[PDB]
């Protein structure tokens, strides 16, 4: 059947970047043309693969990580960047083979008065490793004295909210992101393009 990309890209609700949602896609025919021929995507950078010849290849699995960030942070969803997001929220590996897709979601994720559901991680004791995700709400210690309840001398809650208002600057508007990673194992290739040897 047709791979359920509709359910990922047209997802009614999206996830906070700190708790980025992954969907494994398997056992279907992936019509990648439907994506790159929707010319509504503001970012569509692919690394290590052809633009259209993905439509001919087969893969053991396709993983779709998806989340929401602000526009000027999109540049961090790429190999070997630093910044709040790539360091503390969603790190891509250096040898990344796959595609990063982003589009402006101001008319869906901003609301008059402000949307404070979409969060991100502000403080972490160290950097995330590639494809790692952290959703702990452990009280961050920046000061010297231990915290055990809520807050004290430099004892910040680690998560912060984006404030998404429809009248924010373009750079401060919400963008929805989908990262396709491709997996080819010594195992049955279940995700195939229509122009393959298999059909």
């Amino acid at each position, epitope marked *: 059947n047709l791979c359920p990309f509709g359910e990922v890209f047209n997802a009614t609700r999206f996830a906070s970047v700190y708790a980025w*949602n*992954r969907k*494994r896609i398997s056992n279907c025919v992936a019509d990648y043309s439907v994506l790159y021929n929707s010319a509504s995507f503001s970012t569509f950078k692919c690394y290590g693969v052809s633009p259209t010849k993905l439509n001919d290849l087969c893969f053991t699995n396709v993983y779709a990580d998806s989340f929401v960030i602000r526009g000027d942070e999109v540049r961090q969803i790429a190999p070997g960047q630093t910044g709040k997001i790539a360091d503390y929220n969603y790190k891509l*590996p250096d040898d990344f083979t796959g595609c990063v897709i982003a589009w402006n979601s101001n008319n869906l994720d901003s609301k008059v008065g402000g949307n404070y559901n979409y969060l991100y991680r502000l403080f972490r004791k160290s950097n995330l*490793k*590639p494809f*790692e*995700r952290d959703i702990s709400t452990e009280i961050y210690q920046a000061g010297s004295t231990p915290c055990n309840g809520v807050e004290g001398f430099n004892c910040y809650f680690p998560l912060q909210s984006y404030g998404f208002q429809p009248t924010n600057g373009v750079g401060y508007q919400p963008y929805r992101v989908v990262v396709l990673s491709f997996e080819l194992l*010594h195992a049955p290739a279940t995700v195939c393009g229509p122009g393959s040897h298999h059909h």
Partner: antibody, heavy 128, light 108 residues
Framework: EVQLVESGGGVVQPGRSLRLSCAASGFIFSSYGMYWVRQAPGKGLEWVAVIWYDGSNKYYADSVKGRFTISRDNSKNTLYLQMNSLRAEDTAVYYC?????????????????????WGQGTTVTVSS | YELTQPPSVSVSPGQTASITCSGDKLGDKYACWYQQKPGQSPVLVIYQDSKRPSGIPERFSGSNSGNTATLTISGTQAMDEADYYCQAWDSSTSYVVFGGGTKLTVLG
């Protein structure tokens, strides 16, 4: 008490085949990646296979690729290793082990950290 | 991909002992350390480079930087004499790799 118990080892002839079991108890088995790791006599630990909390994804070491099959029955709290075409260099103690990370169930995401629970092992001698 | 350890490391009781583990871009993956006494199963003593599991003595610490992970036992004791293995789970391929192990002798 968290507990892993291996069983089904023994003496077996090369080229034949054998099915090992690992019985889990005292934790929500269905929510953890599981490992098979072996140790030949006087050698080090050799990774054999690994399986996702739900059995969706399976990875094998090259030495056993195509010959072994890892599987799990989540309803019965059990991990299985089907060993086929046994060679002599397969003689070893076989441990099952649990990864310390658990999936909540909601979005096909898993990251493997250390293997914090180990069984006591089951011994497989493959001789003619 | 291979993780390569010192074959043996001896140490007097009370001294600090260090076991190294080298691999290609090992800093970019998490390292685990397991202890195995004779005729016993392995036990996890370090995970996530430096975190110590519940119930593991505090004298066990761990680091990982560059291409080298290091298990450190300060105040080494008789009951620490064992084989120690490092391990890395590649973030890609989801492929597990042990080290050759290290025979930590405690001169008792």
């Amino acid at each position: 008490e968290v507990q892993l118990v291996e069983s089904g080892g023994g003496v077996v002839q090369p080229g034949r085949s054998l099915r090992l079991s690992c019985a889990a108890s005292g934790f929500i088995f269905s929510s953890y990646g599981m490992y098979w790791v072996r140790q030949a006599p006087g050698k080090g630990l050799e990774w054999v296979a690994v399986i996702w909390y739900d059995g969706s994804n399976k990875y094998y070491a090259d030495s056993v690729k195509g010959r072994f099959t890892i599987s799990r029955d989540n309803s019965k709290n059990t991990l299985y290793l089907q060993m086929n075409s046994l060679r002599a260099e397969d003689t070893a103690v076989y441990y099952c082990a649990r990864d310390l990370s658990s999936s909540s169930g909601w979005d096909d995401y898993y990251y493997y950290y250390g293997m914090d629970v180990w069984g006591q092992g089951t011994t497989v001698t493959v001789s003619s | 991909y291979e993780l390569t350890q010192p074959p043996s490391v001896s140490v007097s009781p009370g001294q600090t002992a260090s076991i190294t583990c080298s691999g290609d871009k090992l800093g970019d993956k998490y390292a685990c350390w397991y202890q195995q006494k004779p005729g016993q199963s392995p036990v996890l003593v370090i995970y996530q480079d430096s975190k110590r599991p519940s119930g593991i003595p505090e004298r066990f610490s761990g680091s990982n930087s560059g291409n080298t992970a290091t298990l450190t036992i300060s105040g080494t004791q008789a009951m620490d004499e064992a084989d120690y293995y490092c391990q890395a789970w590649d973030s890609s391929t989801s492929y597990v790799v042990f080290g050759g192990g290290t025979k930590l002798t405690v001169l008792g």
